Paper text:
A truncated form of A49 lacking the N-terminal 12 amino acids (A49 Δ12) was thus expressed and purified. It crystallized readily in two distinct conditions, and diffraction data were recorded to 1.8–1.9 Å resolution (A49 Δ12 ammonium sulfate and A49 Δ12 sodium malonate). Residues 13–17 adopt three distinct conformations in the 10 A49 Δ12 molecules observed in the two crystal forms (inset) and are disordered in one of the two molecules of A49 Δ12 per asymmetric unit in crystals grown in the sodium malonate condition. In four of the eight molecules of A49 Δ12 grown in the ammonium sulfate condition and both molecules of A49 Δ12 grown in the sodium malonate condition, a single residue (Gly) of the C-terminal purification tag is observed; in the structure of full-length A49, the final two residues (161 and 162) and the purification tag were not ordered and could not be modeled. Visual inspection of the structures of A49 Δ12 and full-length A49 showed that, in all cases, two molecules of A49 self-associate via an interaction of helices α4 and α6 (the “4-6 face”). In the structure of full-length A49 this interaction is formed by crystallographic 2-fold symmetry, whereas in the structures of A49 Δ12 the interaction is formed by pseudo-2-fold non-crystallographic symmetry. In the structures of A49 Δ12 salt bridges Arg136–Asp92 and Lys103–Asp139 are formed, although these bonds are not symmetric and thus formed only once per pair of A49 molecules. In A49 Δ12 hydrogen bonds are formed between the side chains of Asn88 and Tyr102 and the carbonyl oxygens of Thr128 and Val95, respectively, and between the side chains of Arg136 and Asn96, although again these interactions often occur only once per pair of A49 molecules. Additionally, we observed that A49 crystallized much more readily upon removal of residues 1–12.
VACV protein A49 prevents translocation of NF-κB to the nucleus by sequestering cellular β-TrCP, a protein required for the degradation of the inhibitor of κB. Unexpectedly, the structure showed that A49 possesses a Bcl-2-like fold despite not sharing sequence identity with known cellular or poxvirus Bcl-2 family proteins. Strikingly, despite a lack of sequence conservation with known family members, A49 adopts the Bcl-2 family protein fold comprising five α-helices wrapped around a central helix, α5 (45). The A49 structure shows that A49 lacks a surface groove compatible with binding BH3 peptides and is unable to bind the proapoptotic proteins Bax or Bak.
Residue numbers in the entry: 13 to 163
C-alpha cells in the first residue's frame, strides 16, 4: 500500500474529510477534467476526490475480474451501460455517481471501446456539476463503504 500510512479504514475516513475540506477550492471545470482523466487512466492524486475514487477502486480490487466481464459484453450492452450510468451525473445519489465513474473506467480499459467512446465521454463529462452531491453525501458514502468492504 504505497502512498498509504495506516489501514484502509483510516484512509477512507481521512480522504473523505479532505474532500469536504477542499471541495470548494476546486473549480468545477478542473474537477470534471480530473474525472475524465481518472476514467482514461491518468490519476491526478492531487485532487482529493480523485484520491478518493482511486482508493475506492483499489478497495473494490476488482480490476482483473471486471475486465473479463466487460470483454464478454456486446456493443448493445455497452451502449446501454454507458447511457444508464451517465444519468447518475445529473441526479442526487453519490454512490451511483462513483459507480458510474468506476464503471466507465473499466469500460475504457478495453481498447476497442476506448477508441469508439472516449471522445464523447470526455465531451459530456465536461458539462456536469456534481459538487453539491459530493458535499451532501461524501461522508456517509465513505462510512457505508468502510462498513461494506472493510468491517
Amino acid at each position: 500500500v504505497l502512498g498509504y500510512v495506516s489501514d484502509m479504514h483510516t484512509e477512507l475516513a481521512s480522504i473523505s474529510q479532505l474532500v469536504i475540506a477542499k471541495i470548494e477550492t476546486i473549480d468545477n471545470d478542473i474537477l470534471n477534467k480530473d474525472i475524465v482523466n481518472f476514467i482514461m487512466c491518468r490519476s491526478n492524486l492531487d485532487n482529493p476526490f480523485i484520491s478518493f475514487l482511486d482508493t475506492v477502486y483499489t478497495i473494490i480490487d476488482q480490476e482483473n475480474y471486471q475486465t473479463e466481464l466487460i470483454n464478454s459484453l456486446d456493443d448493445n450492452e455497452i451502449i446501454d451501460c454507458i447511457v444508464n450510468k451517465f444519468m447518475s451525473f445529473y441526479k442526487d445519489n453519490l454512490e451511483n455517481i462513483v459507480d458510474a465513474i468506476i464503471t466507465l473506467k473499466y469500460i475504457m480499459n478495453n481498447p476497442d471501446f476506448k477508441t469508439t467512446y472516449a471522445e464523447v465521454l470526455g465531451s459530456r463529462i465536461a458539462d456536469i456539476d456534481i459538487k453539491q452531491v459530493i458535499r451532501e453525501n461524501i461522508l456517509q458514502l465513505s462510512n457505508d463503504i468502510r462498513e461494506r468492504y472493510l468491517g
